[PDB]
UniProtKB/Swiss-Prot annotation, chain A:
The keyword Nucleus does not apply. GO terms for cellular component: cytoplasm; cytosol; endoplasmic reticulum; extracellular space; plasma membrane. Its EC number is 1.2.1.5. Keywords: Acetylation, Cytoplasm, Lipid metabolism, NAD, NADP, Oxidoreductase. It catalyses: an aldehyde + NAD(+) + H2O = a carboxylate + NADH + 2 H(+); octanal + NAD(+) + H2O = octanoate + NADH + 2 H(+). Coiled coil: none annotated. This is Aldehyde dehydrogenase, dimeric NADP-preferring. Homodimer. Pfam families: Aldedh (PF00171). GO terms for biological process: aldehyde metabolic process; lipid metabolic process; xenobiotic metabolic process. It is found in: Cytoplasm. NAD(+) binds at G187, S188, T189, G190, V191, G192.
Length: 447, 452
């Protein structure tokens, strides 16, 4: 099949030794830098057509992070790839002890549709840096970006080492029968199970970046003008379609109306009276997701928004009040511009609420009390945490990005990408010289 | 069921918060140190009955490494558990950025039979240190150690947090239906697939310490006296039943006879003329495995040994020469005191030989040439590597132990155990004050574009 042949060529190219010299890997990363620069308009056009992004947010909410990653990895690659001496003991003073990093082989990156450039190429950057061949499967739901990458990736990168696999669910299923040395998947919790099950057939390690409802706790006595502007920004970017969007708010009932008012104020600053006319507001990816998100508004109290246009997949920025935690909008990851407010009567109740649910990819808290922040972190578990902001923690080179429990396993970004896509091999090198300190180990044992 | 209740109690005890303070973790670890001290004779007795171990090798080839791990983790725990500040950026200079470590919850450790104390308890030590409840499933093949641990673990450790699950494969299958937050499994490549598949149903991360044939390349130009003594020691300890035993030798045909000779020389110093009479030589674990290992001698050219005793499951230390790489003894992990010598014409043929097979848990090479060592490491892949010795690389606090490919995924020992059994959670904590610098990110975006 075309899939088998593509994987076979990538494997043969890897086994030839082509990717081992750092110079080769840097040449490929520099080719990706050129692709991003030369194809800027085409990348913007694809993201506009798929998700209703514009020239500015295509770059500053997505493409720029890929560039930052490439530049950082080129800079640090020689240091990261070096053999790493480790601590000795008195019995190992004459020995060499070190960690050797080496590629895994052929890595599969399965992209997702909501940041279809970042969530295909930023993982690929790390896997190239670690000296692997990298097969890419873009998501079919972001059709324009999938077609674009199929054209431009082989225009810039080694055609055998870094193939793009076209198609949808059937093609992904076929692809998952091939033997890889690592799979990174971004997407849903339920499909993550399917990936890990396919991986098990070949004992392939996985990085799974999955889902959940990222809670956003807002403390009673904090600056709500600042908090709500930050929350609105991260909730409503990409029309709510972000893995670490603050999915819902937990707050004391006494501040619910203040939160509604300040969210509305910020939404109007950001997108105007009619968000459908804002160049900065996105659209839902597909008809199925549009219907799904609209359905989550049914039965709810709408404090703002609550309308949509099916033809162009616009959903007005929507705020829901006094939400029942058992209702549909509180029983699945929203992935859309619908923000429910659930009342809780204390920090302790908020912590209980979070802990009774599955572990989220992100947990957020807004408070000017550092003790509240530390308590909530200490007593909960989530992939990552931001206090007094949203989103930003997954963009930093020094903070590995990943989930826990149903939000996933493993992590990447920066140095962690290099480690994730390498095997770190423990090495002991001894002199081949008779040693008297060793003789105690050999039989016969002493009485 | 008994299984469902044990897991339910462990989960509830974890949820009570009792494992979170370091004081409690250290107490439990100190309870294991007491167990090892107070139960010294009972442990030797179990290993003697299971594997024909004695008081010396029970300790220095197994139990001591658990003790060293406990002592090391107790001393380092506060540092390891501390929030870990990370590098800032100009944009985050006024924020706090750090990695927060926290337990995963309930960890399952599935033991194996060949080092049935170390390969049950050493993983447990790490999982305890990271603040988890830990359910243990010992291997039934080491029956005496399995029954001893079910008795003594609850005598020393918290009863609800650290239960022992009895039984064989049916019970392990039932146990694997329960929901854990991590599973560590030591055993076979085949069964690792089954474990990872069961784990997927709850998105449970796995550490799989699996198998393969660890090759041992011997350079023409090296000191064969020193080399072969080291090889013999690693190969024949525990009657060959070690995950990182040097499984087979690759050598130039011009040195095969010298290798046979020096191996024989060391075997006689170790165990005498008749290894059946040595208190230091083990026995095969089970009838099933005795029959399997003996089958691997069939149709082979025997240079030394080659006989066994079904009644005592003794297999004489056996060396095979000019072995066909396609023959049974070269097509499965031996896990027995049968050492095939496979001929190669060069280092380059050895590298290709190794690369055409599945990635082994350990790779060994004997050579006084630095360039030979560097090149073999550069051009192959294995869990870990030792040059000029065997076994010892998995006994050091600073060298994580684990496989790659069919030999496994993940690793543990020392700090790596703490990391493996924790979730490492990235945290950004910003001040909640107006920051002019953030306003760039808010819509509306600028209506004109500028250079990037
Ligand atoms: C899941 C990660 C994600 O959606 C993302 C990527 C890049 C920038 C922001 C968010
Ligand atoms: C697989 C690990 C193993 O058999 C071992 C443990 C401790 C010492 C030697 C070998
Ligand atoms: K309501
Ligand atoms: K001795
Ligand atoms: K630390
Ligand atoms: K602005």
């Amino acid at each position: 099949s075309k899939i088998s042949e593509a994987v076979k060529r990538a494997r043969a190219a890897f086994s030839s030794g082509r990717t081992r010299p750092l110079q080769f890997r840097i040449q490929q990363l520099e080719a990706l830098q050129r692709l991003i620069q030369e194809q800027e308009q085409e990348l913007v056009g694809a993201l506009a057509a798929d998700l209703h992004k514009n020239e500015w947010n295509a770059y500053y909410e997505e493409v720029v992070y890929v560039l930052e990653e490439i530049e950082y990895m080129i800079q640090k690659l020689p240091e990261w790839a070096a053999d790493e001496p480790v601590e000795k003991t008195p019995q190992t003073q004459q020995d060499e002890l070190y960690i050797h990093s080496e590629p895994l082989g052929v890595v599969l990156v399965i992209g997702t549709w909501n940041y279809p450039f970042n969530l295909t190429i930023q993982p690929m950057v790390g896997a190239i840096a670690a000296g692997n061949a990298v097969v890419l499967k873009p998501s079919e739901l972001s059709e324009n970006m999938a077609s674009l990458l199929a054209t431009i990736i082989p225009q810039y990168l080694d055609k055998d080492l870094y193939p793009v696999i076209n198609g949808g669910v059937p093609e992904t299923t076929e692809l998952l029968k091939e033997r890889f040395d690592h799979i990174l998947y971004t997407g849903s919790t339920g499909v993550g199970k399917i990936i890990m099950t396919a991986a098990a057939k070949h004992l392939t390690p996985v990085t799974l970046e999955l889902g959940g409802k990222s809670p956003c706790y807002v403390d009673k006595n904090c600056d709500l003008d600042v908090a709500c502007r930050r929350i609105a920004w991260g909730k409503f970017m990409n029309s709510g379609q972000t893995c670490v969007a603050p999915d819902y708010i937990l707050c004391d009932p006494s501040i619910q109306n203040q939160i509604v008012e300040k969210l509305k104020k910020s939404l109007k600053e950001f997108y105007g009276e009619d968000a459908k006319k804002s160049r900065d507001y996105g659209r839902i990816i597909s008809a199925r997701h549009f219907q799904r998100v609209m359905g989550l508004i049914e039965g709810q109290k709408v404090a703002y928004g609550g309308t949509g246009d099916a033809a162009t997949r616009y959903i007005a920025p929507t705020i829901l009040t006094d939400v029942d935690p058992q209702s549909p909008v509180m029983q699945e990851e929203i992935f859309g511009p619908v923000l429910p407010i659930v009342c809780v009567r204390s920090l302790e109740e908020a912590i209980q609420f979070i802990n009774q649910r599955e572990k989220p990819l992100a947990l957020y808290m807004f408070s000017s009390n550092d003790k509240v922040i530390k308590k909530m972190i200490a007593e909960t578990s989530s992939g990552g945490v931001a206090a007094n902001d949203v989103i930003v923690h997954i963009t930093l080179h020094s903070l590995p990005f990943g989930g826990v429990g149903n939000s996933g396993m493993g992590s990447y970004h920066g140095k962690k990408s290099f480690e994730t896509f390498s095997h770190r091999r423990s090495c002991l090198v001894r002199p081949l010289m008779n040693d008297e300190g060793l003789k105690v180990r050999y039989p016969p044992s002493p009485a």
